[PDB]
Amino acid sequence: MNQVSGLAGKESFILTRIELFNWGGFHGLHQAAIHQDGTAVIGPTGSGKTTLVDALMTLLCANPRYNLASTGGHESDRDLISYVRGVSGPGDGGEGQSHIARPGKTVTGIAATLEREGKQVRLGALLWFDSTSSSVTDMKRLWLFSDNPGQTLEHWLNVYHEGGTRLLRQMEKEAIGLWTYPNKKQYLARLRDFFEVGENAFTLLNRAAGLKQLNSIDEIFRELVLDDHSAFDRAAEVANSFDG
């Protein structure tokens, strides 16, 4: 039983930390440690367990499906904007128009650490608003990849608070083992390169968090694995060309 427990973290990178800052209902800086022999996230329904999974998936995927466990089958209610702003759609009772926890200028950071035989790899994301706007184009994003133990989400937040994106870029220039991407496509490409797995792997990892609404093998295959790759849009273009 315990002999097998040592296999994890030897030939693979295992998650061993999550750090959040102004993410969902996690106001301030929160840190959670994850054991190398499997970990359980437990708590009364309506805390921040789905919030944590969504932070991790945001760090991992390109268009993560938020709250997939309960909203599977239909479109998700939550989005990145509502996590950054800390909206409280569900819990009401004194709801002041969705009770946006952080309506003004704000910064939210998320960070996940992975380890293998003492080698560390940290994924991070800083998402901030400079005004009261809530448009997707008004949120400034900076993704971070690191293999240096000294590059922690706390350090990134300190640098941001001190000197905005200018000092963030300057720190990246003089930092050893840090890579900052302003556009998530390049950051996901770097993740793909490091972990030698295509986008389908992380998309499937995302879909795995919504396995509750399962059915016969056919639905599990056509809805969980072997992602869509459908051709319902190409058919429309073909039809329009044939109309011409």
Partner: protein
């Protein structure tokens, strides 16, 4: 002289417009990068000159 960024943007838009075709091997993952790469392929091929 067309600025490099504008040419890359135009090539990326054209590349996305024809992602379906199998001949072109256009990758939807990050068309912009591919466009840039393509342009560079023709800069060291001497079709165009960068300065």
């Amino acid at each position: 002289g067309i600025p490099l960024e504008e040419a890359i943007q135009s090539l990326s838009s054209i590349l996305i417009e024809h992602v379906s075709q199998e001949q072109y091997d256009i990758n939807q993952d990050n068309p912009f990068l591919q466009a840039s790469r393509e342009l560079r392929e023709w800069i060291k091929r001497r079709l165009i000159v960068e300065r």
